[PDB]
Amino acid sequence: ELAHAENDVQKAVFGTQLAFDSASFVTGAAGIGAGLVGASTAGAVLGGAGVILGGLAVGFTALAQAFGAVAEDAKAVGRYFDTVDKAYKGNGYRYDNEKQVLVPLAGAVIKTLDLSKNQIDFDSQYIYRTHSGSTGSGKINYFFWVGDFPRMVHDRGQAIEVRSGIGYKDVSRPLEHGDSNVVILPGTPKSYISYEYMLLPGATTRHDAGFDVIRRLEEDKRFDYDFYIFPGEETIRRIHHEYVDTPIEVVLDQRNRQLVAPELPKELHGFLCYEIKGAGGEYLIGLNEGAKVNLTSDVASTWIIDSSQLASDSISVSKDQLLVGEKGKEVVVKLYLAQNSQVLVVNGKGEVRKVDFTSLTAQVISEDASKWQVPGQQIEQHLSDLAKAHQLHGQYVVVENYRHQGRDVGRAFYDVTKDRMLFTDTTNEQAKRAQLGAVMGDYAYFYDADNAVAWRVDIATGQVDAQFEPWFNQNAGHISRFWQEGDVVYLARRYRLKEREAELGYRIIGDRMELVSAVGDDALLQLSARIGRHGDELEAILQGYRSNSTQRGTLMYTLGARLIQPTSAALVTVFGVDAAGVPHRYWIRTSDGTLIKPNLAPPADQTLHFEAHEQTRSAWQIPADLVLAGSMPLLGGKEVFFFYSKEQKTLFRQEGPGQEVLDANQPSALRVTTPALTNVINLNGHLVVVTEDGRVARLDALGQLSYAAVNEHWLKGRIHWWQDLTSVTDGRATLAVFGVKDTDGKSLLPVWYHNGQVVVASAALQDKHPQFLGFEVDGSSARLFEPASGKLYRQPAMTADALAAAFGTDEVLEASAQLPAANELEPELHLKAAEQVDAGL
Numbered sequence: 091e092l093a094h095a096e097n098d099v100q101k102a103v104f105g106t107q108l109a110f111d112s113a114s115f116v117t118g119a120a121g122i123g124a125g126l127v128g129a130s131t132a133g134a135v136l137g138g139a140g141v142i143l144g145g146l147a148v149g150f151t152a153l154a155q156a157f158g159a160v161a162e163d164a165k166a167v168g169r170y171f172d173t174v175d176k177a178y179k180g181n182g183y184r185y186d187n188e189k190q191v192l193v194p195l196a197g198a199v200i201k202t203l204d205l206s207k208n209q210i211d212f213d214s215q216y217i218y219r220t221h222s223g224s225t226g227s228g229k230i231n232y233f234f235w236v237g238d239f240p241r242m243v244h245d246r247g248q249a250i251e252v253r254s255g256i257g258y259k260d261v262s263r264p265l266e267h268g269d270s271n272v273v274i275l276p277g278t279p280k281s282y283i284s285y286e287y288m289l290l291p292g293a294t295t296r297h298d299a300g301f302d303v304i305r306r307l308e309e310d311k312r313f314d315y316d317f318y319i320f321p322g323e324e325t326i327r328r329i330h331h332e333y334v335d336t337p338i339e340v341v342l343d344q345r346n347r348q349l350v351a352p353e354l355p356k357e358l359h360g361f362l363c364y365e366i367k368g369a370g371g372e373y374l375i376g377l378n379e380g381a382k383v384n385l386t387s388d389v390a391s392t393w394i395i396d397s398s399q400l401a402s403d404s405i406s407v408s409k410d411q412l413l414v415g416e417k418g419k420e421v422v423v424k425l426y427l428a429q430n431s432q433v434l435v436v437n438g439k440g441e442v443r444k445v446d447f448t449s450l451t452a453q454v455i456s457e458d459a460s461k462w463q464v465p466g467q468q469i470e471q472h473l474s475d476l477a478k479a480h481q482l483h484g485q486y487v488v489v490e491n492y493r494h495q496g497r498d499v500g501r502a503f504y505d506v507t508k509d510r511m512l513f514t515d516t517t518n519e520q521a522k523r524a525q526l527g528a529v530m531g532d533y534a535y536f537y538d539a540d541n542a543v544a545w546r547v548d549i550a551t552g553q554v555d556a557q558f559e560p561w562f563n564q565n566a567g568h569i570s571r572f573w574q575e576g577d578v579v580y581l582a583r584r585y586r587l588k589e590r591e592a593e594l595g596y597r598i599i600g601d602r603m604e605l606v607s608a609v610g611d612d613a614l615l616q617l618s619a620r621i622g623r624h625g626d627e628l629e630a631i632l633q634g635y636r637s638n639s640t641q642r643g644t645l646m647y648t649l650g651a652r653l654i655q656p657t658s659a660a661l662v663t664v665f666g667v668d669a670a671g672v673p674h675r676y677w678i679r680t681s682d683g684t685l686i687k688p689n690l691a692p693p694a695d696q697t698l699h700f701e702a703h704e705q706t707r708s709a710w711q712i713p714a715d716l717v718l719a720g721s722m723p724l725l726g727g728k729e730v731f732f733f734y735s736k737e738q739k740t741l742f743r744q745e746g747p748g749q750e751v752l753d754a755n756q757p758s759a760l761r762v763t764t765p766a767l768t769n770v771i772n773l774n775g776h777l778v779v780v781t782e783d784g785r786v787a788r789l790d791a792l793g794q795l796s797y798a799a800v801n802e803h804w805l806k807g808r809i810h811w812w813q814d815l816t817s818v819t820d821g822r823a824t825l826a827v828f829g830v831k832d833t834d835g836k837s838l839l840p841v842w843y844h845n846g847q848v849v850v851a852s853a854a855l856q857d858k859h860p861q862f863l864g865f866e867v868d869g870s871s872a873r874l875f876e877p878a879s880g881k882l883y884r885q886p887a888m889t890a891d892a893l894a895a896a897f898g899t900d901e902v903l904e905a906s907a908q909l910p911a912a913n914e915l916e917p918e919l920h921l922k923a924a925e926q927v928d929a930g931l
C-alpha cells in the first residue's frame with residue numbers, strides 16, 4: 091500500500107543520480123593538497139548545513155560544475171602567460187620564409203626597431219603589487235581573519251616593473267632573417283595588469299599550459315601565485331588590462347621596403363603612436379585605423395601612404411599634418427618632412443595624389459598603375475591572423491572617463507566577450523574611482539576599497555539600483571575584502587575600536603544582506619560562554635560596537651541610495667581569543683537562539699583536569715581550523731553535532747548543543763575513531779569522509795560509517811586491484827570504483843563491485859550514466875537502469891580472467907575492449923524511475 095519503505099534490501103549508498111565523472115573529480119580533489127572541499131570561509135561550516143536533505147550525488151555535480159568553471163578561467167590565464175612567453179621567446183618576431191614578410195608576434199611589447207641595425211629594443215608590462223595584513227605572521231595571530239587575505243596594490247608607483255622574471259633579460263637582440271623585405275609594425279600597447287583570485291583545488295599542484303610562467307614570477311614577494319590559505323588553494327581567476335600610451339619608434343634604412351600598420355580590436359584604437367624615421371628612398375607606410383604616426387625624413391625622401399586599408403579614401407591637408415579616413419575618425423599623420431621630402435597618397439586602384447602644402451589640394455595624377463607596392467593578399471592574410479589573437483584574449487579592459495551619453499560615468503570595464511557591459515551608471519566623483527568586486531548574470535557588484543559603500547549595477551544597463559549599508563557606519567576601518575563564491579558574495583568589513591581592531595562578515599543573496607560572522611568582544615565572549623538565548627538581537631552586538639563612534643559617517647556619501655540593511659542568518663558564528671591560551675567559538679542558532687558549544691575531549695592518551703576558576707572552558711582548546719559539519723537527527727532524543735579539524739585530522743561528535751555552562755572537567759564532544767581521516771564532505775546535509783588510503787564511507791547519527799567506494803588514490807599503482815578490492819570491507823560490500831578510465835585516458839569507465847562480482851558498463855552504456863541494480867537470483871545477470879533512455883538492461887559479470895584480458899596492469903581499459911555487451915531486460919516499458927525494493931524492483 092502506497093510507497094514502499096522496505097528495510098533489508100541492501101540498496102547501494104550513492105543511489106540514483108551517481109555520475110562517476112563528478113564524484114571521481116570531487117573525491118580526487120578532496121584527496122590531495124590539504125584543502126577542504128565545499129567549505130564556507132566567512133561562517134565556518136561545511137556544505138551549507140542549513141540544507142539538511144537532498145540528493146547525495148547532486149552535490150558532486152554542483153561542486154564539479156563550479157570547479158570546472160574556475161578551472162577554465164585558470165587555464166585561460168595560463169594560456170595567456172604561455173602566449174606572452176612564446177612572444178618574448180624568439181625576440182618578438184618571425185620571418186615568413188615562404189612569402190617574405192616580417193610579422194610581429196602576438197604578445198610582446200617593444201620600444202623601437204633599429205631596423206638599419208636589425209636590432210630590436212624591448213619593453214616590460216607591469217603587474218600591480220601584492221599586499222596583505224599581518225595577522226598571519228603576528229598581531230592577533232591565532233584565528234584566520236576573513237579580510238586578511240592577499241590583495242592588490244592599486245597604485246602604478248609600485249608595480250613589479252619587469253618582464254625578466256619570465257626567465258631572461260636583455261636590452262636588445264639581433265633579428266635573424268628579415269631585411270630588404272616587408273614589415274608589419276607592432277600592434278599591441280603597453281599594459282598595466284590587474285588580477286583577481288579564486289579558490290581552485292589543486293592549483294598548487296596542477297601543471298597546465300603556461301602555469302610555469304606564473305610560477306616563475308611569484309618567486310618575488312611583490313607578487314604571489316601558487317599559494318595556500320586556510321579555506322584552500324587559491325588561484326588567479328582572470329586578468330584586467332589597463333593600457334598606457336605607447337610610442338613605438340621605427341628607424342628605417344636605405345632600402346625601398348614597405349611598412350603596414352595592423353588592424354586592432356575596437357578597444358585598442360589610439361593607444362599607439364609610430365615614429366617612422368629614416369633617410370632617402372621611396373618607402374610606403376601602410377595606414378590603418380586607430381593609430382597616430384609621425385614622418386621624420388629629415389635628410390631626404392619621398393614617402394608613400396596607402397589609404398586603401400582604411401574604410402574610406404577621403405583626405406585633407408594642412409601645413410603641419412594630414413588626415414585620412416572619414417567621419418572625423420581620420421588617422422592623423424604629422425608631416426615633419428624636410429629638404430622637399432613629399433608625401434604621395436595612394437588609393438586602392440588607378441590613382442595617386444600629390445599633396446600640396448601650399449595649395450592644400452590633392453591634385454590628381456595617374457602615377458599609380460605602376461607596380462609600386464606589394465599585392466594586398468599576403469598582408470591582408472597576416473592582418474587577419476593577428477586580429478584573431480587580440481580578440482581571443484577574452485579577459486577584461488579598464489576604461490577611464492567613459493562618457494556613456496555625453497555624461498562622464500568615470501571608470502568602466504569593457505567586457506571583451508560581450509556587450510560592453512559594465513560601467514557605474516551614475517556620475518559621482520567618488521564612484522568615478524569605484525572598484526569592481528563581482529559580476530553575475532546581468533548584475534554587477536562594485537565597491538569602494540576605502541569607504542563603506544557597495545552598489546548593485548547594470549540592471550538592463552538602466553539606473554543604479556541599490557546600495558548596501560553595514561550595521562555600523564560611524565567608526566574607522568574599511569571593507570577589507572570583497573569577493574564571491576558560488577553566486578553568493580561576502581563582505582569582510584574591518585572595524586577599528588579603541589580597544590581593538592575587529593571584523594564582521596556579511597553574506598548577500600538577492601535582495602538580502604545577511605550577517606554570518608562576528609568577532610565580538612571579551613565582555614560578549616565570556617557572557618556567551620554560558621547561558622544564552624537572545625532572540626531579536628545577536629548577543630547585543632549593537633551595544634558592543636556602536637558606542638565607539640569616530641565620525642566615519644562623514645564619508646557616507648549616501649548618493650540617493652535605496653538602502654538595504656543587514657538581517658541575521660541561521661548559524662551566526664562568534665569567535666575570538668578571550669585571553670591568553672583560551673580561544674572560544676560558538677554558533678548561535680538564530681532561529682531558536684541556542685548556542686552550539688564545543689566541548690572538546692583531550693587526545694585518547696591524555697586527560698586533564700583544571701581549576702574551578704578557569705572551569706568555564708572547553709577541555710581541549712578549540713583549534714584554529716575548526717568547522718561545524720552538519721548536524722543529524724539521532725532518533726534518540728537529541729540532535730547530534732559534529733566538529734572537524736583539518737590540522738588535527740579528527741572528527742568530534744557531540745549530542746545536543748552542549749551544556750548550559752561549559753565544564754572543562756568532563757568534555758562532551760567525543761573524538762570519533764576513524765582511520766587516517768583526510769577530509770570530510772557535507773552533501774545536501776549528508777556527511778562523507780575520505781580516508782588517506784582512498785576509501786569512501788557515508789556517516790550517520792550514531793557515528794557509524796558504511797564503506798561505499800574506493801578512489802583513484804586507492805587504485806593507483808596496484809597491478810591487480812580487482813584482487814585487493816576484496817580487502818576494503820569485511821564482507822557484503824557494494825562499491826563504486828571511481829578510478830577506472832576509458833581507453834582514451836580521459837573519460838571514466840563506470841565500474842561497480844558487488845558481493846565479489848565486478849560490473850563494468852560496456853561501450854553503449856558508458857555515456858548514458860549507468861545506474862546499478864542488484865543481481866538476478868541466478869547471480870550473474872546484473873540489472874542496470876539508464877534514466878535518460880528510460881530503459882532497463884542486463885549485463886554479464888566479468889571474470890578475473892576476462893578482467894586480465896580487458897585490463898593489462900592498469901586502471902585504463904585496453905583498446906582490445908573485448909567487453910561483454912548489454913541487452914535490454916524489459917523492452918516494452920519506458921520508466922520514469924527504477925529502484926530496488928525487498929520484494930524486487
